[PDB]
Amino acid sequence: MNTVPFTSAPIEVTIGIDQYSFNVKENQPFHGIKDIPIGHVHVIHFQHADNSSMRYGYWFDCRMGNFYIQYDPKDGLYKMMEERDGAKFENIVHNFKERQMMVSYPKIDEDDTWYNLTEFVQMDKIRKIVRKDENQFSYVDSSMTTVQENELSDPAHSLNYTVINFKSREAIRPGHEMEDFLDKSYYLNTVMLQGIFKNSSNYFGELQFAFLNAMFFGNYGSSLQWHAMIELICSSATVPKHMLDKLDEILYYQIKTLPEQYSDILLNERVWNICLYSSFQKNSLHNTEKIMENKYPELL
């Protein structure tokens, strides 16, 4: 059971931890979050009560170091930091709990949502997408562009997602133009799985990371990358029978977690009608088809 303590809450703010969130009033005596399940990656995120452009957060695993949040009044935002002094850390944490200034990671014990949305997301793969190797944690906000979004500006503040492009030499074997474009099995199996990701778990980890960045930050690029990784699988005649089975699971929990009211900005009508009804995998995402048709029938 790990802790992210806060120096204070100077400014009014809605704090988020994984799929949960609470309002902290300006100079309400709040001093952090305890009881964060060890063993998964987490994300703490902020939207201030003043402007809603400021939607920012940090991906972290407390198995990597001792993290705390301190408001910096110059950059004007809640900043994550690492305490290298174990002793000073465990000392301030125990003080704040005894005082009871910490909210509890509110986990219902039957609930496997977070595990199901993060099953293949590993911090190390995160630190290769939000390059800033002088922190164990990784910063993300609404604005950050993708490397693919820079090509179609600032390369230090990019999301370095794997580049998927259905109209590229990488996706199309010369002489197979038709075959490879209608059936992306090559681009998925040889080029991407075997070529770049190595295994289905790293692919799923990106797909999963992309979605959460989309849903927690309304990050347009992450959403483009989520839809693309889905479409690639749905647009392949030849997919490992285990991958189809796992994806249907991953997408079920993603559609389940999605706030009802953001359906219209986070869901690509075209990719979903293709996946569930046109593509090779129309008959292969049973749990995904059921929760889509019952929760978002309007989009099909």
Binding site: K167, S168, R169, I172, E177, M178, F181
Partner: protein
């Protein structure tokens, strides 16, 4: 993006561009079989590739053979079309490759774009214009060369004949689209108008009769009169 009524005179500048019409690539006849079911019989096709500036027509003849053993022919026709365009671009010197290829049917965007990945600086554009290039097979010499052929085969013409000697591309193109619209609306009529006077003939390397300026004004008006007749006769106006 899309070629429309606004960006029309760009056809005639000094940027090399080709139109591609794929409507006559895949052609069939429909018949009743012995058991009383329906079947198709593929016939010779052609890709229509035109430089509207010069009038240079790259007519790729498509032999029935190409369809043998293949499924989703109508879909295949579009990929075959894109392969044949790609090959024609690759065979041309760099200074003759086109900067734009305008396709007449949006369904050719994806095939052509995929096949031209080696030509990043060649824009594939659709058009909003309702261009009558499908009537290309109602030109006697084009039909004849297509239907006589016994193998794949590229044939070259200037669809403006020698008009550019006397008029501009803009005018040449208008004469062309007017002639093709007539042909499309009422082939029998349009052809009667074009060949009535047997003393005006078709040069051997030409597709249209060797009309005088005065005689082209006659013809153009008769084609227009013919297009209007068949319109009001079909919407009872």
């Amino acid at each position: 993006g899309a070629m429309n009524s606004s960006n029309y005179a760009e056809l005639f500048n000094n940027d090399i561009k080709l139109f591609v019409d794929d409507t006559n690539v895949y052609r069939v006849t429909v018949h009743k079989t012995f058991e009383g079911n329906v079947a198709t019989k593929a016939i010779n096709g052609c890709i229509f590739t035109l430089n509207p500036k010069t009038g240079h027509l790259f007519l790729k003849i498509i032999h029935t053979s190409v369809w043998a053993g293949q499924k989703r022919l109508s879909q295949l026709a579009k990929w075959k079309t894109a392969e044949e365009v790609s090959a024609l671009v690759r065979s041309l010197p760099k200074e003759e490759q086109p900067k734009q290829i305008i396709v007449t049917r949006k369904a050719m965007l994806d095939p052509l774009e995929v096949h031209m990945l080696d030509f990043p600086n060649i824009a594939i554009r659709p058009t909003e214009l309702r261009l009558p290039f499908s009537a290309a097979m109602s030109i006697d010499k084009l039909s004849d060369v297509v239907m006589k052929a016994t193998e794949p085969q590229m044939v070259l013409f200037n669809i403006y004949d020698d008009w550019l000697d006397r008029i501009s591309s803009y005018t040449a193109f208008s004469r062309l689209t007017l002639l093709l619209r007539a042909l499309k609306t009422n082939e029998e009529s349009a052809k009667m108008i074009l060949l009535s006077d047997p003393t005006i003939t078709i040069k051997s390397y030409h597709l249209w009769p060797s009309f005088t300026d005065e005689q082209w004004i006659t013809i153009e008006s008769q084609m227009r009169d013919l297009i209007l007749t068949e319109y009001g006769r079909k919407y009872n106006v």
